[PDB]
Amino acid sequence: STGSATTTPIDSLDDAYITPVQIGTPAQTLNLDFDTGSSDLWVFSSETTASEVDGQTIYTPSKSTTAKLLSGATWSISYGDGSSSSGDVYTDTVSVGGLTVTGQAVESAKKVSSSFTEDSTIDGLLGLAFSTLNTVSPTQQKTFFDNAKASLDSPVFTADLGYHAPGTYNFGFIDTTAYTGSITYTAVSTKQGFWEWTSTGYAVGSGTFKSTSIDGIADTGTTLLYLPATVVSAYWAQVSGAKSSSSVGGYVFPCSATLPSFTFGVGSARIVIPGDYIDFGPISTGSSSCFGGIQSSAGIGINIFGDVALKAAFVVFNGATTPTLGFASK
Numbered sequence: 001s002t003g004s005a006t007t008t009p010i011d012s013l014d015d016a017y018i019t020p021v022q023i024g025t026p027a028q029t030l031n032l033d034f035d036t037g038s039s040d041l042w043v044f045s046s047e048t049t050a051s052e053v054d055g056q057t058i059y060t061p062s063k064s065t066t067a068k069l070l071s072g073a074t075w076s077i078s079y080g081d082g083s084s085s086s087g088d089v090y091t092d093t094v095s096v097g098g099l100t101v102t103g104q105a106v107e108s109a110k111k112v113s114s115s116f117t118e119d120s121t122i123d124g125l126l127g128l129a130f131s132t133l134n135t136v137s138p139t140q141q142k143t144f145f146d147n148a149k150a151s152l153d154s155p156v157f158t159a160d161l162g163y164h165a166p167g168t169y170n171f172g173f174i175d176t177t178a179y180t181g182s183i184t185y186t187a188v189s190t191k192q193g194f195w196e197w198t199s200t201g202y203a204v205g206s207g208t209f210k211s212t213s214i215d216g217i218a219d220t221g222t223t224l225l226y227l228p229a230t231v232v233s234a235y236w237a238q239v240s241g242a243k244s245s246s247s248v249g250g251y252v253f254p255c256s257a258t259l260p261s262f263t264f265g266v267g268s269a270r271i272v273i274p275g276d277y278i279d280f281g282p283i284s285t286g287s288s289s290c291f292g293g294i295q296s297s298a299g300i301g302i303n304i305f306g307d308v309a310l311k312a313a314f315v316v317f318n319g320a321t322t323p324t325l326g327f328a329s330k
């Protein structure tokens with residue numbers, strides 16, 4: 001089996017991407033945020049506190065002939081941005097881009113934090129990190145990808161995120177027309193439950209490449225690129241007027257600036273993030289101060305190759321017995 005689904009930015013800044021997912025029988029289509037940095041598939045539902053729902057499409061298990069309560073199971077998750085949600089659990093049939101899994105744990109939200117309520121475009125999350133991070137208790141559940149693996153032609157999925165444009169998530173195959181050149185694969189550690197790998201270094205604009213090991217995670221659910229303070233300072237030092245602002249919460253720069261590109265290493269390969277991808281626009285409507293797409297990881301505890309980095313590449317999440325990550329230009 002394979003699946004192929006288009007993923008679409010939620011707004012003009014590519015803050016996140018939504019992918020339509022069919023749940024239940026007859027199908028209920030919800031737009032979910034595919035997140036390679038977490039391992040829960042959870043949805044706004046008929047059980048979600050009414051005051052915490054504002055425009056989202058909800059899953060109603062009572063309208064699905066294939067839904068079954070997973071009796072006694074509960075879940076509760078917090079994310080790196082401080083957002084959170086919790087609830088109970090159903091099993092149901094879930095299909096992504098034509099690929100169907102039966103008996104998938106669909107985590108029904110009873111409560112969601114304000115950031116979720118305020119984002120009317122996101123109907124839930126579909127986690128694609130390792131199942132060891134799944135929060136369901138007392139019986140931990142498998143991700144959509146882990147459940148699908150047995151049926152897939154190849155135990156892989158790929159992320160091909162667009163810049164100000166739709167992209168694609170594929171399951172079970174590598175689309176050789178979707179990238180240029182060759183794919184460079186690099187080792188993954190699953191010790192922390194993430195797609196964790198080690199970049200071989202970086203360059204700022206046309207500057208020389210600095211060979212240095214940067215351990216981090218490939219996280220489609222994080223918007224920006226979070227790197228060590230040394231690296232981030234070297235980048236922003238090349239932008240006149242750029243500074244880290246405690247009031248704003250990170251690096252800002254004059255909107256009149258032209259931003260340099262940022263290159264990261266994958267083995268001997270090099271992925272170039274265009275300067276344009278690092279401009280997140282005015283900090284508030286009408287401001288002449290713009291927010292940077294490369295930020296320090298110093299307050300996070302982990303480096304994160306979020307959408308800013310991943311969108312510059314065709315990315316292969318290889319879930320074979322020995323997992324690896326592949327990057328190609330596109």
Ligand SMILES: Cn1cnc(C[C@H](N)C(=O)O)c1
Nearest residue numbers: 035079080081221222223224
């Ligand atoms: C729900 N969620 C999953 N990951 C996040 C991270 C968040 N999108 C950020 O960029 O900081 C939120």
